[PDB]
Amino acid sequence: VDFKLSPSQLEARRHAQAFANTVLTKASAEYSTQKDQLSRFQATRPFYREAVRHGLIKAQVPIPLGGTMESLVHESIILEELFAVEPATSITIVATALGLMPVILCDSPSLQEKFLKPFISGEGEPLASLMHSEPNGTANWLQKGGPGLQTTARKVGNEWVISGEKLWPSNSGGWDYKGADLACVVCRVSDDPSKPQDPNVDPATQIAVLLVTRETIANNKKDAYQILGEPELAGHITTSGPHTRFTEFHVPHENLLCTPGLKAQGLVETAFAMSAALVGAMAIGTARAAFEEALVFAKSDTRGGSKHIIEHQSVADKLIDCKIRLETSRLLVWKAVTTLEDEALEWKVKLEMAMQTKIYTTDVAVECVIDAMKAVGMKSYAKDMSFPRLLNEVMCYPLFDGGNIGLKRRQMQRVMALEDYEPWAATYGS
Amino acid sequence: VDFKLSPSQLEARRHAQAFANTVLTKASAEYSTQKDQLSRFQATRPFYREAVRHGLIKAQVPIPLGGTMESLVHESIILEELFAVEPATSITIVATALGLMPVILCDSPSLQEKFLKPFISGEGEPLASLMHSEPNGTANWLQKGGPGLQTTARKVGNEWVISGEKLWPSNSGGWDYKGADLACVVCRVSDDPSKPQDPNVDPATQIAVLLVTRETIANNKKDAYQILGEPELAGHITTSGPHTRFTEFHVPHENLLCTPGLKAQGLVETAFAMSAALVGAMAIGTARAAFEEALVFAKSDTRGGSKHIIEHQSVADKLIDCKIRLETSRLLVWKAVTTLEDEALEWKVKLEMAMQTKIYTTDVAVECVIDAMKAVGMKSYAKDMSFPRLLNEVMCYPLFDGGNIGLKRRQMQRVMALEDYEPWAATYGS
Amino acid sequence: VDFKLSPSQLEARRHAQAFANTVLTKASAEYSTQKDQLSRFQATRPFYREAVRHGLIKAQVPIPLGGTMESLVHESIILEELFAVEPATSITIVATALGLMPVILCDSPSLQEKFLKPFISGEGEPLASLMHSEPNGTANWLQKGGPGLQTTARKVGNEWVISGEKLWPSNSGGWDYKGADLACVVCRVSDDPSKPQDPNVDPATQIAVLLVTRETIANNKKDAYQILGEPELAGHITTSGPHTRFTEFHVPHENLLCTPGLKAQGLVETAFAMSAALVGAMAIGTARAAFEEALVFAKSDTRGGSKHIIEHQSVADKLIDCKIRLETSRLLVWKAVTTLEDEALEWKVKLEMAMQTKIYTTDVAVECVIDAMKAVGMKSYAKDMSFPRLLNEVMCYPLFDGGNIGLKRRQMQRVMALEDYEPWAATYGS
Amino acid sequence: VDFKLSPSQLEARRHAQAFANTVLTKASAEYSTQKDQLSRFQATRPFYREAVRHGLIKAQVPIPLGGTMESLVHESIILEELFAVEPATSITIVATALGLMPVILCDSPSLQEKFLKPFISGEGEPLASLMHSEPNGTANWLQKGGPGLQTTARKVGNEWVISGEKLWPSNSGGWDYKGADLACVVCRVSDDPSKPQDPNVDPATQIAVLLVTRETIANNKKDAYQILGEPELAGHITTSGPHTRFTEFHVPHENLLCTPGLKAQGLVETAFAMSAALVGAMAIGTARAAFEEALVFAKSDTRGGSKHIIEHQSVADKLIDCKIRLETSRLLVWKAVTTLEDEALEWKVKLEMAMQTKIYTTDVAVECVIDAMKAVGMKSYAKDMSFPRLLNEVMCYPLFDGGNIGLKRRQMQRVMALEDYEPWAATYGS
Ligand SMILES: Cc1cc2nc3c(=O)[nH]c(=O)nc-3n(C[C@H](O)[C@H](O)[C@H](O)COP(=O)(O)OP(=O)(O)OC[C@H]3O[C@@H](n4cnc5c(N)ncnc54)[C@H](O)[C@@H]3O)c2cc1C
Ligand SMILES: Cc1cc2nc3c(=O)[nH]c(=O)nc-3n(C[C@H](O)[C@H](O)[C@H](O)COP(=O)(O)OP(=O)(O)OC[C@H]3O[C@@H](n4cnc5c(N)ncnc54)[C@H](O)[C@@H]3O)c2cc1C
Ligand SMILES: Cc1cc2nc3c(=O)[nH]c(=O)nc-3n(C[C@H](O)[C@H](O)[C@H](O)COP(=O)(O)OP(=O)(O)OC[C@H]3O[C@@H](n4cnc5c(N)ncnc54)[C@H](O)[C@@H]3O)c2cc1C
Ligand SMILES: Cc1cc2nc3c(=O)[nH]c(=O)nc-3n(C[C@H](O)[C@H](O)[C@H](O)COP(=O)(O)OP(=O)(O)OC[C@H]3O[C@@H](n4cnc5c(N)ncnc54)[C@H](O)[C@@H]3O)c2cc1C
C-alpha cells in the first residue's frame, strides 16, 4: 500500500490552487453586488468560462471518452483545492460533472460521441444537470407501495411525453432559463399520470432517463417547460437549482438514455454513488479553509494576553479535533474513489464504501467549521473573516447529494442487511 | 421543590407571545429591505418603541427601583418567547438590560435614581449598553502580567479622560451614532496611556467603570467620540455593536460608578454572570423554533413515501435529541436564575451555576438546530423556511456574552479549583 | 417554581448517606470472596437485612398503603446517595420497589393489604420482583402480528397455568431459588401455546399479570418451576436476575392482578414509566462517584508537574462536562418525578417526560464516567480506584429497565407521533 | 496512491488469524482459573512460548537486525488480527516490541548484536520492557521547572547507580519477578538523588536509558530490586506491569544505551511515537470484535419481533457509526505507519501524524464498543457474550501508551505551535 503522490497528481494540485487563487478569488466582487440567486449565478459565467479555458470541464470526462480526467484521486485533489478558496463556479463545475455521469456511465459510444461533444471542446460555457430531485422529495422514490417520482414519462408514438416537476437540480435552467446544454431527466414511467403508481410493481423497473438539450426545449411549446422559481439558499449563494414544470413535454426517442427499468435505475444509482464519494472532497475544502484560517489566527494572536492563543489547551484541542477530522476525511475519500475504480470488487462493496464516505466527511465537516469558530471566538462571527460564508456553505453537504438521514444511511443499511455482505471486502478482498 | 407556574408567570408568557406575534412578526418586512447592519438596526426603531409601549424595557428594572421585573423566572419565560419568534428588537431589549445591570447593582441610590429614570418612564426609545469588549478581545482582561484592557481612563482635575477603542457592545452608539442614552464604559485606570500595564499590580484593582450619556457625548469635541465601523454579523443581522474610538474623552467625576478596583470589577463580574444565566433563554428560544418547525413538518410530510417522516426511527431520534436538549436547557436556566436570587448562597456558587448554564445551553442549541435541519433534509436549506436564519442566529450564543472557550470555562475552572469549592451547595446547601 | 428542599428531604439524604457509609461499605468485604453471582447475592443478605431494619423497604411503599414513602423527590435523593456509594443491596431495594409497583398502582385495596404486608412490616428480608423480560427479548412485546411474550398463561378450572421462560428479572428467585416473596409475572394469554399469537388481535388485550409467592411455588411439582441459570454480569455483580422456566405451573385465580387485557398492560406500562424516571438517580449516583473521585484527585495531584492537574485546561474541561451532565441529569429527574405526581396532567405527557429522562440520564452518565477516567489518566484503570467498578456499573443503565434504543426511544416516538401531542404541556400546562 | 495488499501482507493476515484461532482461543481456559494479575500472566507463558515458535517475536525486529519484520503495515495487520480474538499474550508481544525499540533505534551495532540476540533466536520465552512510567506519573517529565522523573541515575566510578520507582511497564519483572530479559530503564541524571532537578537545566538534557537484564539483577544485592506490587487492572487482566523499586542499583557503564541528554530523550520519544501509531491497530482489533459480534447478532436475531433487528433504523445507525469509526481508524493507522517509514519527511511531521492516530483510534474505539452494546441491548451485559471483556479492554487504550489528555494532545499541540508547522506535509509533501 502506498500514499505517495505522482508528479501529475502534484501538478493537478498546483494547477487548481493557481486557478482558484488567481481567478476565483476575483469572483466575489462580481456576485456580491447582485440581488438574487439567479443574478448571482449569472455573474459567475465569466469565471466558468475561465474554468473551461483552463480545461477543468474537460477534466470532468474520462480520457477514453476524449476528456482529460487522469483518475478520481486527481479529481479529489482538484475539488478540495477549489472549495478551500471559492465554492462559487466550483459548484457549477461539479454539477455539470454529475450531469455528465449518466452519459459517462452508459455503455453506448454513439450517445457518448454526441452528447459529450461540447463539454470536451475547451470552449463555450456548457452546463449539464442531473435532474432528479422533486418538490415532494425523493428519499423514498423506490419504495414499493408509494407515490414514486412525480415527474412521469409515457411513450406517445415515436417520442416521449414528460409531466411533473423537479426542484434543486443544479444548472437545470442553464445560464438563461432556456435550459442546460444537457440535462438527464429521471422519470417514473406511467401511462396515465393522474393514476397512482401500481402498488404491486417494483418501482425500480419503471425508471426512465431522458436527455433534454436546449433544442428539445426550443422544439416545444413555451409553456411545456416553465421555471416556477429559484430557491434562495443559506449558502452556495451563486448556484442555480430551479423549480421546473414539464407539461406535455415532447422528447425524441433518440434521446432516451437506455431501455427503461432496472438498467436506468442502476445508472442513476451508479451516478449518485460516485459523486457521493467525491462530495467529501468538497466538504474537506470548506473545512480545510475554516481550520487553516483558525490555525493562523491562533498562532499570530494573543487575544489580549501574554502568549499566542494556540498555547491554551482548549484552543489547541479544537484545532487538534479539526485536523483529525480533516485527515481522516481525506483518507476515506481517497479510499472510496480507489474502491470505485477497482474492477475486481462487487458493486455492493463499492456502494457501501461510498455511503460511509459521504456520511462521515459531511457530518464531520460541519463539526470542524463550528469548532474552528469557537477557537477564534467572537471575531469569527463577522463577515470580515470567512467563517460566516463557511458556516452556511458547510451545512449544505450533509443535506444535499442525497441527505444522510433519509438516503445515505438507508442505502448503507440495506447493503449491511444482505446475507452475503462482506464488511471488509474493500480492504482485505473476498 | 415545585415546578408550577403562577398566574403572573403565565401572563408574562401570554403577554410576550402576544407581543412577538402581533408586533415582532412585522419587523422583517421593514429591515429585509435595508442594505447594511446599521440601516437594518434603524428600521428596528419603530419596534423598540412598541416594546417600550408594552413596558418591556420597564420590566428590565427591579420593582425596588420603580421597574416592573417580577422575577428572573418571569424574565426567562419572556426572553424565550420573544426569541422563538424574532430576535430583532428582542436583542436590543436584552442589551439595554445588560447596560443597566451595573447601575442596578451598585450601592448608590442617587446614581440609580438619576440614570435609570428614562428606562422606567414608558416613553421614547431609551437605549443602554455595557461597553466591555475591545478589538484585541478580553478573555484575558484580568491576567496579571498582561496588557490588560486597552481602554484606559486617567484623572485630570475633577473629570476623567478616556483613551482607547471598544468593539461589539450592543447599542453603544445609540440609534444615530450620537450614542446610547446610558453607557457603562469599563476602563483600566492608567496615568500614562502609552505605558504598558504594570505587571506587578493585580489587574482587578485597576478597573473603573464610567457612565457615558448622550449629554456627555455632546459636551465633547466631535473627534473625541468616533464610530470607526459597524461589523457585518453572520446572524442577528439587525443589531449594532459598533467600533468606537475614545480620543481624549471628558467625563464628569460625578459619573464614576463606584470606587475603582475590586468593587468595579465585582460589578462587571456580577452583571455579566447574571446575563450569562439569562442568555440560555435566548438560546432555548431560537432552538425551540428550529425544533417546532421541524416537528410540525415531521408530522405532516411523507417526503414522497407512504408514512409521515416522523415514523422513521432516524428522524424521530433527531427530534427526541432536540427535545431532550431543550428541556434540560430550560430546567438549567430556571435553576440558574433561582440560584442568583437565593441570598443564602456564597457568590462563587452562583458564579458556578451561571457559567455552567451558559456553556451547556448555548453549545447544545447549536446542535439542536442542526439536527432539526438534518431531520427536515434539503428543504431546511432554503430561505422559505426559518432554518437559514436560525442557523446563523444560533451560532452567536456560544460565542457572545463571553465566549464559552475563553471565558466561561475559565471562570468555572477557577471556582472548582478553590480549596472550599462545594459542587452541590446550590442543591444541598452548605 | 421552587428548588429548595424541605427539612424532611434533607433528613432523607442524611439518613441515606449515613446508611451507605456505615453499612453498605462493609459489603465488598463479604461479596469479594464469593465466586459467582448467586454467592455474591447471598452474601448481600445481611446488608438488605439492615436496609429493612432502617426502613428502606418500608419507604418504597406509599403512605396511604401503610408504608413510609414521603415523595418521589425523597426517593430520588435517597437512591442517588445509595448509588453514589454502593449498588449492592441498593439495586435489590429498587428492584423490590419495581416488583411492588403493579400492586401499588392497582386500585384493589384488599389485594394490596394482603401482598404489601411483609414489605411494610420492617422485619425479615422480603424480596419482590417484576418478572417481564425474556430470553427472546421484549422490545417488540406489543408488536401486532409479532410472536409476543413467550411466557403464556391459560385458564383451567379456577386456576391459571403458566408455561415459558423469563430472564433478567431482579430478585425473581429469592435468596434461595425457591422464589421471591412476591413476583409479578407478565403473561400473554393463550389457550394453546403451541400455536403462534393471533396476528389479527392487538397484543395489549392479551396481557395478564399473575402474582406468584413462595407458597405458590411450594404448591407445584419440582420441575414446574426451574432456575436454569444465573447470567454473570459485567457490573452489578451482586444482583440476581435468573433464567426461569415455568412448565405447567399452576396459579390460583385469586392471584390474578386484574382482568386480563388493556387494564393489565396499563399497569405494566405505568410501573416501568415510573421506574424509568427514577433510574436516573441511580445513574447520577454512579456518575457522581466518578466525578467526585476525579475532582478530589485533580485538586490534590500534580502528576509530576509543578501545579495541580485541575489547573490544566483540558482536565478542567472534562470535569466541567461531568458536572454539567450531572446537574442537568438531577434537574431532569426531579422534573420527571414531579410530572408523574401532577394529577392534572395526561398520562401521555408523563410518559414522554419519563422516557426523556431515562434516555438522557443513562446515556450521559456513561460519558461522565469515561471523561472522569480520562482526566485522572492511567490510574483510573486500576482496582485501587473506583473507576473499574463504576465503568462496568454505569454501562448497565442505558441497557436496562427497557433499553434506550429498543424501548424508551420507541415509546417516546409513539407519543410525539400522536396527533394531539403537546410538547410543553409538562411545563406550560394544557 | 494505492490500497492493494501484497501476497506477503495477506499471508501475514492469514497466519495471524490461524495463530489467534488455534492457539489464543485456548488461553482463557488457563488464565480464568487463576487468582490475581501475576498468576493469570504466568498461565500465559505456554502461549507466548507458542508465539515465539510461530516466529511472532522475531517479527518484532527488523530484518537488517536479524529479525523478520517485513513492514509496519504487516505489523498493523498482525496486531489487528491478534487483538480481535485475544489480547492475552498479544499484549505481551507488543510490550516486548516496545521494550526492544530503543535498542532497535540506537545506531550502535554491538549493543544491537548483544541484547537482541535472544528475541531473534526463535527459542525460549524472552521478554523485554520499556520502563518509563512512574507512581507520580510522567506526563510532565520534560517540564522545565518540574521535579522530573523520580528514577534517577548517578555515575559512581565505572558504573551507574539507580535510585527510584517504576510503575506500569509491561513485562518489566519477567515471568518470575527476577526481571525482564531486557529492561530499558529510563532515568533522570542526578549526582545527588535527594536534590530537586535544577530548574535552570532543560530536563531533556538529563535523560539516560540504562539496559537491565536478568544478569544485571543477579549481580546486585537482593533488595536493590524489589517488586512492590502488581496493579489489579480493569481489562487486559493477564498482563504484568509491576511496581518496582530500585535502591542503589548497580549497572555497568557499557549497558548505557547512548550519551545522556537530547540523544537519549530522542530514542524514548521515537519508540513511543512509533507504538502510538501501532496501538491504533490494537484498538481496531478490540472494536472490530465488538462490531462483528453485534453485526452477526443483529443480522440474525429479531428480539421477539418479526424482522431481524438490523431492519430497525436506530440499530442500523449504531452499526454504521461503528463501521465508519473502524474504517477511518485503519486508514489513519496505515497512513501513520507509512508516514513513519518515509525517509523524506521530518520528524515533527511524523510525530504529529502518530499523535493524531493514537488520539482518534483510541478515543473512537470506545464509542464503537459502547454503540455495539446498545445495538445488541441487554444481552451484551452478560459474559456469555464478548462485550463485557471488550468494554474493559477498550478503556485501556486512550489512557495507556501515553494518555491522550496529558501527553498526546500536548505533544501534538507543541508541534502545531511551531513557526514552521506544515499541516499537510505528510499528504502533499514538503
Ligand atoms: C447546492 C445543491 C445542489 C443540488 N444538486 C442536485 C443535483 O445536481 N441533482 C439533483 O437531483 N438534486 C440536486 N439537489 C438536491 C439534493 O441532491 C438533495 O439531497 C435531494 O433533494 C434529496 O433531499 P433529502 O436527502 O433531504 O431527502 P427528502 O426526500 O427531501 O427528505 C428529507 C428528510 O426526510 C427524512 N426522511 C425521508 N424519508 C426517510 C426515510 N425513508 N428514512 C429515514 N428518513 C427519511 C430525512 O430526515 C431526510 O433528510 C441539489 C441541492 C442543492 C442545495
Ligand atoms: C450580538 C452581540 C452582542 C454583543 N454584546 C456585547 C455587550 O453587550 N457587551 C460587550 O462587552 N460585548 C458584547 N459583544 C461581545 C461579546 O460579549 C463577546 O463574548 C466578547 O467579545 C468576548 O469575546 P470572546 O469570548 O471570543 O473572547 P476573546 O477575548 O475575543 O478571545 C477569542 C478566543 O480566543 C481563545 N482564548 C483567548 N484567551 C483564552 C484563554 N486565556 N484560555 C483559553 N482560550 C482563550 C478563546 O477560544 C476565545 O474564544 C457582543 C457581540 C455580539 C455578536
Ligand atoms: C496495559 C498497560 C501497559 C502499559 N505498558 C507500559 C510500558 O510498557 N511502558 C511504560 O513506560 N508504561 C506502561 N504503562 C503506562 C502507560 O504508558 C501510561 O500511559 C503512562 O503511565 C502515562 O499515563 P498518563 O498519560 O495518564 O500520565 P499521568 O502523568 O499519569 O497523567 C494522569 C492524567 O493527568 C492529566 N494531566 C497530567 N499532566 C497534564 C498536562 N500536562 N496537561 C493536561 N493534562 C495533564 C491528564 O488528564 C492525564 O490523563 C502501561 C499501562 C497499561 C494499563
Ligand atoms: C440489573 C438488572 C436488573 C433487571 N431487572 C429487570 C426487571 O426487574 N424486570 C424485567 O422484566 N427485566 C429486568 N432486567 C432486564 C432489563 O429490563 C432489560 O432492559 C430488558 O431485558 C429489555 O431489554 P432490551 O431493552 O435490550 O430489549 P431487547 O428486546 O432484548 O432488544 C435488544 C436490542 O435490539 C434492538 N431492538 C429491538 N427491537 C427494536 C425495535 N423495535 N426498534 C429499534 N431497535 C430495536 C435495540 O438495539 C435493543 O437494544 C434486568 C437486567 C439487569 C441487568
Q: What is the CATH number of the domain that holds D324?
A: 1.20.140.10
At B74, is the secondary structure helix, strand, or coil?
helix
Residue B259's alpha-carbon distances to A215, B187, B263, B264, B266, in angstroms, are: 81, 13, 6, 7, 11
* Residue C202 sits in the same domain as residue C325: no
Q: What is the CATH number of the domain that holds A167?
A: 2.40.110.10
From A234, which residue of chain B is nearest by alpha-carbon distance? B388
For residue A392, the number of C-alpha atoms closer than 13 Å in the C-beta half-sphere is 24
CB A204 within 8 A of CB A262: yes
The span from the CA of B388 to the CA of C72, in Å, is 43
A73 and A47, same domain (yes or no) = yes
**Residue B350 carries which side chain, given as an amino acid letter?**
K
DSSP-based three-state secondary structure for B182? strand
Backbone angles phi, psi at A298, to 5 degrees: -65, -15
Q: Which helix (H) or strand (E) holds D421?
A: none
| Strand-pair partners of A186 | A209
Determine the Cα–Cα distance for residues B191 and B201; give it in Å rounded to an integer: 14
Minimal Cα–Cα distance from D315 to chain B, Å?
9
Mention every residue, 6+ apart, whose C-beta is less than 8 A from residue C245: C164, C165, C225, C226, C228
- Measured in whole angstroms, the distance separating CA C259 from the mean position of its chain's CA atoms is 25
Residue bearing the CA closest to ligand 2, atom 40: B406
On whether both D110 and D77 belong to a single domain, the answer is yes
Tell the residue number behind the cell numbers 502580567, with chain if given.
B145
The answer on B309 and B255 residing in a single domain is no
Nearest ligand 4 atom to alpha carbon C399: 19
Cell of B287: 432552538
- Taking the CA of residue A320 and the nearest CA in chain C, the distance in Å comes to 12
Residues of C in contact with D399 (CB under 8 A): 373-374, 377-378, 380-381
Q: Distance between CA C264 and CA C210 in Å, rounded?
A: 10
* CA neighbor of B122 nearest in space, from B199, B68, B43, B193: B68
What is the rounded distance in angstroms from the CA atom of residue A413 to the CA atom of residue C263? 38
Boundary residue ending a domain (B203, B235, B261): B261
The CATH number of residue C52's host domain is 1.10.540.10
**A65-69 long-range CB contacts below 8 Å, 24 or more apart?**
A65/A104, A65/A112, A65/A116, A65/A120, A66/A116, A66/A120, A67/A116, A67/A119, A67/A120
Q: Which atom of ligand 2 is nearest to the CA of B170?
A: 5
- Round to whole Å and give the CA distance between D341 and A106: 43
Report the SS3 class of residue A188: strand
Residues in contact with ligand 4 by the CB-under-6-Å rule are C 95, 98, 130, 132-133, 137-140, 168-170, 233, 236, 239, 241, 396, 399-403, 405-407, 410; D 303-305, 309, 312, 314-315, 375, 377-378, 381
Q: Which residues make beta-bridge pairs with A207?
A: A188
Touching A: which chains, 3+ CB pairs < 8 A? B, C, D
Q: At what angle do helices B347-376 and C313-341 cross, to 10 degrees?
A: 80
Q: Please give the Cα distance from A63 to A48 (Å, whole number).
A: 21
Where does A223-349 show beta strands of DSSP type E? 225-229, 243-252
Query: CA-CA distances (angstroms) from residue A122 to A44, A48, A74, A118, D115?
Result: 18, 12, 19, 8, 66
**Pair B150, B40 in one domain:** no
Residue A319 at interface with chain D, using a CB cutoff of 8 Å: yes
Which of B127, B160, B185 is the last residue in one of the domains? B127
**Which bin fits C246, alpha (ψ -120 to 50), beta or left (φ > 0)?**
beta
Which 3 state secondary structure label does DSSP give D157? coil
DSSP symbol at D198: P
Is D60:D93 a contact under the CB 8 Å cutoff?
yes
Residue B180's H or E segment, with its range, is none
Same domain, A91 and A149: no
Query: CA D364 to CA A277: how far, in whole Å?
Result: 22
**Residue C11 CB burial class (10 angstroms; 0-12, 13-18, ≥19):** middle
Q: CB neighbours (10 Å) of residue A227?
A: 16
Nearest partner of D280 among D360, D348, D342, judged by Cα: D360
Residue A90 CA: distances (Å) to CA of A10, A39, A60, A238: 19, 17, 12, 10
Supply the range of the domain harboring residue A143.
Answer: 128-261
Let me know whether A414 and A281 are in one domain: yes
Q: Are residues A196 and A323 in the same domain?
A: no
Lookup: cell for C161: 397455568
Judgement on whether residues B91 and B166 belong to the same structural domain of the protein: no
> Which residues does a gap of C–N over 2.5 Å follow in chain A?
none
Q: How was this structure determined?
A: X-ray
Q: State the closest ligand 1 atom to the C-alpha of B301, by its place in the atom list counted from 1.
A: 34
Q: Could you say which ligand is closest to the alpha carbon of residue C319?
A: 3
Candidates A400, A408, A412: which one to mutate for ligand 1, based on the most atoms within 8 Å of Cβ? A400
B50 by Cβ neighbours in 10 Å (0-12 / 13-18 / 19+) ranks as middle
- In whole angstroms, what is the distance from residue D189 CA to residue D181 CA? 24
* B313 CA: distance to closest CA in chain D (Å): 5
CA D418 to chain centre: 28
Question: Could you tell me if D381 lies within 8 Å of chain C, comparing CB atoms?
Answer: yes
- Residue indicated by cell numbers 469549592: B421
- Amino acid identity, residue A239? T
| DSSP 8-state assignment for residue A163 | E
Domain co-membership, B178 together with B102: no
Same domain, A380 and A397: yes
Grid cell for residue A131: 435532474
Stretch (H or E) spanning D220: none
Closest to D182 in 3D by CA, of D212, D208, D138: D212
Q: How far apart are CA B104 and CA B109, in angstroms?
A: 9
Report the number of distinct structural domains present in chain C: 3
Burial of A65 (0-12, 13-18, 19+ CB in 10 A): middle
Q: In sequence order, which ranges of D306-386 are alpha helices (DSSP H)? A: 313-341, 347-376
Domain end point (choices D228, D261, D294) = D261
Amino acid symbol at B196: P
Q: How much distance in Å is there from the Cα of A348 to the middle of ligand 1?
A: 22
Distance CA A45, CA B218 (A): 52
Residue with grid cell 431459588, as numbered in its chain: C177
Centroid of ligand 4 to alpha carbon of B108 (angstroms): 62
The subunits that touch chain C, with at least 3 C-beta pairs less than 8 Å apart, are: A, B, D
Q: Are residues B85 and B56 in the same domain?
A: yes
* Helix%, strand%, coil% for chain D, nearest 5: 55, 10, 35
> Active-site residue numbers of A?
401
Q: What's the residue count for chain A?
A: 430
The cell for D7 is 501476497
How close are the terminal C-alpha atoms of chain D, in Å? 17
